[PDB]
């Protein structure tokens, strides 16, 4: 009616106001300051391990806390806890829901969690006393598949689902304590700030919001992508994040100036992006593509500095150790390779 | 290295006890065929054989199958459908229902088309039934449901080149069962790339025996796989 007409026009006045402030702060791009930094040159790095033993494709992995162990979950319904230095399987946990889409590894080295199309999320008691790894809790309450998990500490998860909402449980009793709403599309990923008081999330409809753990809120809302968002992470300083959509571009947003700074485009790339992560010192940016490659972008004046090509199918996940000596990359042919 | 000798000798049993079980559970995984089940609308969820995935299991002449009925999800399939690019076949069920409550065929031709031309589902083969023939036979001779109103080329469509399977097959039904078939195969024979097939059928006119009709045509899908790797075919 008249009010829905005015409300659809009231918003436009607010939105048109917001752009003016953003375009009143830009006085030079990041690519004009860093035209004097000495270019890195070129770097080469070659595989140093190869872990075999899976039967199907791989959707997840998470480096341990001491950068020694790691976890990997596949679609044949089986979790495995490798050892990076000498290639020894230390555990092999069988599941009951064959469709597993994520996993996570506790910061205290004590817990492992995973969930998939079956809506429930399970948490596993690892360093038991009796000597048999079984299900500790079973967190139900979503409506739709579940596509990411993280821990804050022991007994507090923050999770993302497929019905356009996030949740924040507590393992001791099993029931939620908060619920975040405001995404009109499926939610695909999240990451936690390096002080554990915020977390940015990415969703289809091409938006990335900035929430607040203490009370559900939507401090910021960044936009500028051209298609849905697949993977996201923070700059190690906690003062920027980078994200990758399905249009073959990465971007480097900002949490203070509240806009976009610079973009990573190359003419010969027509494939999406499935994972993004930073380096330990924040000078490189390892990106994983669906051209089977894994480029390496200089992150203060965009231009490549190498390639990491060893796979035959797509790259479905990658990470970097906490201290930083290795880059494990999973793939849809069941092989993980510990680059260096 | 007086003690690390013991530990490295201690972990090498935890690597063999695991690897012995992980090999006994590689034969079982290779002896079962997985079968998805996409159903458009309300026709067919347990008719052939009688939250989350709702598995069901059966066996024909000592061969076992698994069937996934994806229920209690939202109707946005462009994210959880690319998880199923590994199954043997994709069973498929359509039915000519009423449009009073929009379009029960033209909303299925555009879904079957999307599974065919997907960049990741380029190596899986559909097995589609054409459900609810005892409903159509009581509507076509009654006139309530028509295909000329929705599909123009039906009135100027020819006669099939095959024969009736049953006594009591009027031109009205035969023109109906055999026009839709030629509307699905107009799609199935236009994809240049990929290596996959399509096996039509008819159902619901007779007592369902589809535990055989899926067994007889899930053998055809693997035979044509071994031939093409020896390059003999």
């Amino acid at each position, epitope marked *: 009616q008249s009010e829905l007409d005015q409300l*659809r026009q009231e918003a436009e006045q607010l939105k048109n106001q917001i752009r003016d402030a953003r375009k009143a702060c830009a006085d030079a791009t990041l690519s004009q300051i860093t035209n004097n930094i000495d270019p890195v040159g070129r770097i080469q790095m070659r595989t140093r391990r190869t872990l075999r033993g899976h039967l199907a494709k791989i959707y997840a992995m998470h480096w341990g806390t001491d950068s020694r162990l790691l976890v990997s979950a596949s679609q044949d319904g089986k979790l495995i806890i490798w050892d990076s230095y000498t290639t020894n399987k230390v555990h092999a946990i069988p599941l009951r829901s064959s469709w597993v889409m994520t996993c996570a590894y506790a910061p205290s080295g004590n817990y492992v969690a995973c969930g998939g199309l079956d809506n429930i999320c399970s948490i596993y008691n690892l360093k038991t006393r009796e000597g048999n790894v079984r299900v500790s809790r079973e967190l139900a309450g979503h409506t739709g598949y579940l596509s990411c998990c993280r821990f804050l500490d022991d007994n507090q998860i923050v999770t993302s689902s497929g019905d356009t909402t996030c949740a924040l449980w507590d393992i001791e009793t099993g029931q939620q304590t908060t619920t975040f709403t405001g995404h*009109t*599309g499926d939610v695909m990923s999240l990451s936690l700030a390096p002080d554990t008081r915020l977390f940015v999330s990415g969703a*289809c*409809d*091409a938006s990335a919001k900035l929430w607040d753990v203490r009370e559900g809120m939507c401090r910021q809302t960044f*936009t*500028g992508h*051209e*298609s*849905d968002i697949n993977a996201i992470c923070f700059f190690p300083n906690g003062n920027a994040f980078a994200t990758g959509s*399905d*249009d073959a571009t990465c971007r480097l947003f900002d949490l203070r100036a509240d806009q976009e700074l610079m973009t990573y485009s190359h003419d010969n790339i*027509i494939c999406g992006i499935t994972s993004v992560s930073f380096s330990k010192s924040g000078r490189l940016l390892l990106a994983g593509y669906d051209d089977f490659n894994c480029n390496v972008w200089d992150a203060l004046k965009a231009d490549r500095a190498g390639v990491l090509a060893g796979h035959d199918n797509r790259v479905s996940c990658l990470g970097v150790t906490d201290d930083g000596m290795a880059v494990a990359t999973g793939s849809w042919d069941s092989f993980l390779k510990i680059w260096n | 290295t007086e003690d690390q000798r013991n530990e490295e000798k201690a972990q090498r049993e935890a690597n063999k006890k695991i690897e012995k079980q992980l090999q006994k559970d590689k034969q079982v995984y290779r002896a079962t065929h997985r079968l998805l089940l996409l159903g458009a609308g309300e026709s067919g969820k347990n008719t052939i054989v009688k939250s989350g995935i709702f598995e069901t299991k059966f066996q024909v002449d000592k061969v076992n199958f698994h069937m996934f009925d994806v229920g209690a999800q*939202r*109707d*946005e*399939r*462009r994210k959880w459908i690319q998880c199923f690019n590994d199954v043997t076949a994709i069973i498929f069920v359509v039915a000519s229902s009423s449009y009073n409550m*929009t*379009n029960r065929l*033209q*909303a299925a031709l*555009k879904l079957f*088309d*999307s599974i065919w*031309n*997907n*960049k990741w589902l380029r190596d899986t083969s559909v097995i589609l039934f054409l459900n609810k023939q005892d409903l159509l036979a009581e509507k076509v001779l009654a006139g309530k449901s028509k295909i000329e*109103d*929705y*599909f*123009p080329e039906f009135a100027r469509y020819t006669t099939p080149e095959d024969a009736t399977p049953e006594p009591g097959e009027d031109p009205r039904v035969t023109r109906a069962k055999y026009f839709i078939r030629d509307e699905f195969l107009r799609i199935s024979t236009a994809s240049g790339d990929g290596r996959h097939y399509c096996y039509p059928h008819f159902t619901c006119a007779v007592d369902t025996e589809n535990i055989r009709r899926v067994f007889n045509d899930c053998r055809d899908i693997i035979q044509r796989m071994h031939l093409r790797q020896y390059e003999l075919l």
Partner: nanobody
Amino acid sequence: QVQLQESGGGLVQPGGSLRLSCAASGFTFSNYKMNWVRQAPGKGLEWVSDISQSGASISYTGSVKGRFTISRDNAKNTLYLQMNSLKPEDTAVYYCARCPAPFTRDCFDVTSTTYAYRGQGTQVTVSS
């Protein structure tokens, strides 16, 4: 961000014509397919037409072939329709729905739930 807003609808007696339009802003318009979608009053959404990326692969619906027409212009970022003779049944709202991904052949945009990348639509009415 993406902005799709349609204009051109109105009111016409049976036997008349009507011309619609569409507008794109925030992406490269010459990379994706496009479509049109209609919603009967108190009914779910149905498919109407489409057009390919360059303008050489058109399709229609079994109830409309011969009466409508779809065409686009890359260098100005616009896309039109063309209705010629309207029955009393051609009364609904019409949206301008883009396809999810670039450099593809396939789309998944009919869903009654919330779906981004889709305009607000114009109203058309027909009666004596």
